[PDB]
């Protein structure tokens, strides 16, 4: 009796292990990232986050790759280099064991994830998808 | 920054404690 849940919280691919992709989220209001490793990692894998803006050529085409600034809250004591939203899948995360995250405050139109420098060979063994929520259009 | 999962190999064990 599984309801059609494609509509009512769909999802797309953000990182296929080889290349990133802009994923439009402006038509939504909530979203998050789901990480899933395909093989055993070797070290902690850091992933940088980027947001973009509508390229002035067309309001529906990817423009630049702006790096979203990390936003701290009260209980934050370990700010990054001035604050740049970046995640890190730690080691000791076997396959059939997924992770998930999100950004506190959104900015832009669509998001993208890229392997932070040094984690590329390891990023080749992990996939990233994005799942949205709350769309009203 | 978190998630949990399952399917950990059951792999039972032995405990013997003789004298």
């Amino acid at each position: 009796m599984n309801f059609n849940v494609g509509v009512d919280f769909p999802s797309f691919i953000a990182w296929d292990g080889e290349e990133s992709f802009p994923v439009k989220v402006d038509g939504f209001n909530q979203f998050g990232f789901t990480f899933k490793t395909i093989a055993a990692l070797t070290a902690a894998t850091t992933f940088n986050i980027f947001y973009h803006e509508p390229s002035d050529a067309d309001p529906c085409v990817p423009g630049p790759a702006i790096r979203v600034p990390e936003v701290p809250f009260c209980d934050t004591v370990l700010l990054s280099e001035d604050g740049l939203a970046a995640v890190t899948l730690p080691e000791t995360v076997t396959p059939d064991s997924f992770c998930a995250g999100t950004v506190p405050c959104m900015n832009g139109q669509w998001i993208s994830i890229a392997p932070a420098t040094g984690s590329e060979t390891n990023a080749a063994n992990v996939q990233i998808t994005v799942t949205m929520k709350g769309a009203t259009r | 920054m978190d998630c949990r999962n399952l399917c950990g190999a059951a792999a039972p064990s032995r405990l013997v404690q003789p004298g």
């Binding site: 809250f73 009260c74 | 405990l15 013997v16 404690q17 003789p18 004298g19």
Partner: protein, 289 residues
């Protein structure tokens, strides 16, 4: 639309507990004092029916000693809007897993609360009389070991004049005792046809897993492989209602820390006041290797 029920699976073991055996004292402002009377001295002599004068004896001491008691405090932050929505009440959950943490820390302190601003646990006091298992000489090695005779003589040698004294140990000890077998190939206890189990209703078996075991987890010592380590803790046996006392002043209390709290963030502060001390630690006794 989904349906909601009112159940909540837990998957959270606290530990065993010993805050019920100790003598409980509700108290007021700190630096409590009390009496310690040393010993009733031999006062009379007797008397032969004839004379008209007695002979004095030696009196005792009272030793009006006193005791202190420690505190426990903590803080936590919250968002303002994030509390209104997200139907489940996080605040009451934090109240719960603050009282619980205070409880478990009080329990751990009453055992291994080493001195400075730490409720002096009767383990580190080392003022209870302790007995130890004797070593056994297997093929001329004199290795430390532990057979059931050690318990036999440890629990029975207690002076029953103190009263019913409760015994505590780890369930690994319970299991290693359960796995004891005679020379015939039969088991030494209860022989409850696959029945023993841990009734432990009121008599002298009481299990705490937040105690240090002498089994080093398991398969260690007694195990078919390498033997014990000497001087290792085994168990205790004391009339805790008079051997050791826990004292409580103010229940775990919370308050929104006015100042440091804003229209977008909320700051809280919780605290409590408790401690413990030893009574006549000549009441109970300890078991070691």
């Amino acid at each position: 639309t989904p349906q909601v029920l009112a159940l909540e699976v837990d998957c959270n073991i606290e530990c065993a507990s010993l805050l019920d055996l100790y003598g409980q004292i509700e108290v007021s402002r700190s630096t409590f004092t009390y009496m310690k009377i040393a010993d009733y001295g031999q006062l009379g002599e007797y008397t032969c029916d004839a004379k008209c004068d007695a002979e004095f004896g030696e009196p005792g001491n009272i030793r009006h000693l006193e005791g202190k008691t420690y505190d426990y405090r903590g803080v936590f932050c919250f968002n303002r809007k994030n509390l209104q929505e997200a139907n489940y009440d996080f605040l009451s959950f934090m109240i719960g897993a603050a009282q619980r943490s205070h409880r478990i820390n009080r329990n751990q302190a009453l055992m291994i609360g080493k001195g400075v601003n730490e409720p002096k646990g009767w383990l580190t006091e080392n003022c209870f009389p302790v007995f130890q298992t004797l070593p056994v000489d297997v093929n001329g090695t004199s290795t430390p070991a532990f057979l059931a005779q050690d318990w036999r003589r440890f629990v029975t040698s207690f002076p029953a004049e103190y009263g019913e004294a409760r015994s505590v140990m780890h369930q690994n000890v319970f299991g290693y005792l359960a796995a004891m077998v005679d020379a015939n190939g039969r088991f030494l206890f209860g022989d409850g046809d696959l029945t023993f189990t841990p009734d432990l209703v009121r008599e002298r078996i009481r299990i705490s897993n937040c105690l240090p075991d002498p089994t080093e987890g398991n398969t260690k010592g007694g195990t078919g492989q390498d033997a014990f380590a000497a001087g290792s803790f085994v168990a205790a046996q004391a009339a805790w209602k008079t051997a050791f006392y826990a004292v409580e002043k103010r229940p775990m209390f919370f308050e929104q820390y006015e100042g440091g709290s804003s229209a977008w963030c909320v700051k809280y502060q919780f605290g409590a006041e408790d401690g413990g001390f030893v009574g006549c630690c000549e009441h109970g006794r300890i078991l070691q290797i």
